RNA sequence: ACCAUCUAGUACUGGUUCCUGCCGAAGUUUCCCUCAGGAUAGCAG
RNA sequence: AGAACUGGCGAUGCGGGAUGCCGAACGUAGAGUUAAGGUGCCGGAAUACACGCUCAAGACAAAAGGUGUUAG
RNA sequence: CGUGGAGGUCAGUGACGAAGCCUAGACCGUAAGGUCGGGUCGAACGGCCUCUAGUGCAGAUCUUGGUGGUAGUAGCAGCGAAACCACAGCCAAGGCGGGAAUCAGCAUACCGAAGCAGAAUUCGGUAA
RNA sequence: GGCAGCCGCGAAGCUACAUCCGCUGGAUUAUGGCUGAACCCUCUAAGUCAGAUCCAUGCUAGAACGCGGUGAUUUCUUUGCUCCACACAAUAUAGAUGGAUACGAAUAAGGCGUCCUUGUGGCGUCGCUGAACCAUAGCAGGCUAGCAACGGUGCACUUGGCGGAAAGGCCUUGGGUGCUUGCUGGCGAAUUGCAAUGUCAUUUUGCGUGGGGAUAAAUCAUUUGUAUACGACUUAGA
């Protein structure tokens, strides 16, 4: 057994705690250092191997790729940090004036029984000329060194019975922390898309809690060197609008995703599998730095995508395939 | 004597400084140590580093030996062995001791002190090698040296402006005294010693 | 094999009960073929 | 590996040597000086003075070498 | 000094409370112990000069009797033990010894040299 | 097929003979050089470049006897909670009895005042201990009179700046109000009997009023199924 991955004690929460960020680039424009989303099932994808010298070089090759259910990231605040001899410390936290019901639920377990006195008087302080809630920005500018944005996911968009919001801190790539806080404030209550941070062929890393076998499993894990193959937009239609297979369909498997994960929002395709099963929230990061190897730098296309259901063994790809061979079906037509 | 005494670890010796601090603590005197990251130990860097690394692996087995990295904690451990710890009297004595890297507030706005007999430069023979302790802490696992130096640099600033203001004030006071000289009160004071 | 008596037998373990003061050693020899025993040489009254 | 002998225990406190040879052999108490052993802290006592040494030690190996350091 | 009994004495104490028992209340004797005040007590005892002995307990894997953990454990939502029990235990070494409660286990390479052309080989050091 | 199962298809889970991935920066040593004495030379004595063992990056847990920020602070325990003003008690001190009375850097040199043809500069000079500096006079510190200045200072305000490392403090403008021992006078001190620390600091907590502020949250239940040996964890609902 691995010595580093011991003891095997289970994680304390579904969300995996991120404790490392890709340094701090003082020259890059302001951008998010990571992304948050939810994990769906898995599928299959094939692409052309442009890698030189490979056995399957310049040939179509099948690769296993998972699908991450990514809801839009709506900013709710930002957190500043200051260097100290006792380690990094969060000097001040601020919020985006207004908070959705899902965000308020995160602070409540018996939400229905509670009088729902969530963020309210704080908004009353904001409901004026600003003063303290505006001087906090100046205080952050004066002393802060690294600023982490505070965002939550649109859980109600995800097909999850649990409507409680999930929130985590994300560091800002850009320098000039004044610009960091200015951009964060301007983005208060705004919605951020995947294209604003990640991009196709980027070697992102995945971190999440492992599957529980029902103590084996249910522990946080980090997987690095995973290449994105296509930015997905499940809000629209015809997600399979690739250059090949001009018979546009949807990435959703027949009858919906197995067990759970009926995609109804943005999604992303990532090379290989991801730790943990569906219904688990997964955070994405740029993998610190980008390797210069062809396996990490080369860009890839996409073609065949499997759509047959897995509620059994799998056969039918689309409902329109059932005709001709079955003759008459008086029960239906 | 001042209720609390702040000792500057700059250019000092760990052994003698720890011994004197422990002796004062046993007598019932409150003492605080600042700029511990700049403390010095006799001998070259290799000798001191080996003497510390061997300690980390001597076993009691994690209940006993702890791979403590902070240089201030290393100094406390050095002073810990010079006090009758594990007892009410010794433990109470240690309660009057605090060690901080650099000079955090409010100790910045207060006069620090030095021990003449614990100065590394004074007691260490000239030309002989010595260890700065900071390098040892960095090599053994400490990683706050960069931040410590960065936030200590601001300590020299602002304090420099305060010193300049105090220098101007003392210049004015000296001018006032010089023009005040030759007065009858001044002459009487000079005659009567003062 | 058991039952009661001669038998409370046949010399090596265990234990050997209140207090204070004073004095206070030895561990070795003598005489019989030794370890079993005693004459005592010495120490202490 | 037996051995002819001279000081010491057995019945022996106490101070010192972290603990197992030195000092000193013992009524209950007050006062002052010491033995052994110590005067950087634990540990009650001078981080005392003076002459040189030593860069790794320092509280059975000495048969030999060092362009290690200081003297005739 | 003290306990059982006996000879002489205190023309001794005692239902207005002696023996016995408890005392975080006191006194005396450095000691075996003695005395006093207080809570129960209900019928006989104490000092002194002597005599007398089945006369003083922490041991005896002691005897008789009683009582704890074990334990509300095996056991038969039941009904209730036994074994064992001076007291210990988390280890660094020598004088043979530096924390709540329950649930789950019993090696490769890096340097210098060889008449090492290359391939390839050997040797002195680092290191497991 | 009610009862006890058998031939093709195939999950649901147990569960691998299934698939992907498994990182880049410092200081060293052995070793190869530079400068350069010991005494021409010398990789070493003062230093330094290249250069594998140690630490960093990363991952995993999180002091359950570590820490920061943040959503809200019982509308009747008869202001219930909270912060304040005054107001009486208990509680104790790891131990006030004038002041922690702020640069940096070197120890084979640094300041201070000045000059400036502004520098590693010139000039005069300071150390050799704080054995000092600020303050210190009044019934343990009162009343009051007069002189010189509007300086010093106890305290309630107000304009503004600095301090995020444990900033929680530093102040700054303007008046207001006491004292002023800077100087000169008038009042009382006794009896605690020749001394008995002769009681003056706050740490915490308890009870009595008035000046404001806000009025919530968690467990069970219900259940969920990513979790699931049993706990636990994850949820939905006035």
Coordinates of C-alpha atoms (C1' of nucleotides) in Angstrom, one line a residue, chain E residues 5 29 32 35 82 105 113:
Chain E
rG5 C1' -8.1 -13.8 87.7
rG29 C1' 4.0 10.5 78.9
rA32 C1' 4.1 0.3 75.6
rU35 C1' -6.9 11.2 81.1
rA82 C1' -17.1 -17.9 38.8
rG105 C1' -6.6 -6.0 13.4
rA113 C1' 42.7 5.6 -13.2

